[PDB]
Design a protein around this ligand. Sequence first.
Ligand code: CA
Lengths: 105, 12
Amino acid sequence: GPLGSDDVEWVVGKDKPTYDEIFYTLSPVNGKITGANAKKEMVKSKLPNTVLGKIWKLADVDKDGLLDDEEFALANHLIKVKLEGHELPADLPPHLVPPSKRRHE
Amino acid sequence: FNYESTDPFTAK
Ligand SMILES: [Ca+2]
């Protein structure tokens, strides 16, 4: 629901257009890239499959084996977090996960 | 349940 009071700033949404540009230049399928294109990119990140794997399991918002716009954004984000010299805690805070996964309680 | 792996990483 746009316009109200509940606004959540998705951290990865501020530097998302970069991953968007990469997203489309990886050859997407129907606007969603598969584990093939994604993994190709992720191995060109030169990171181990273990780190990449936990990235996937956290970044796969749909839990659909694919990386959508927001999923791939999260993936690339965690990759560069490692590049910045950090670790992935295997936790997904409410403002790290797209607000599209929230129920109405 | 029986795992949750369908990712291109944990397949090897
Ligand atoms: Ca997905």
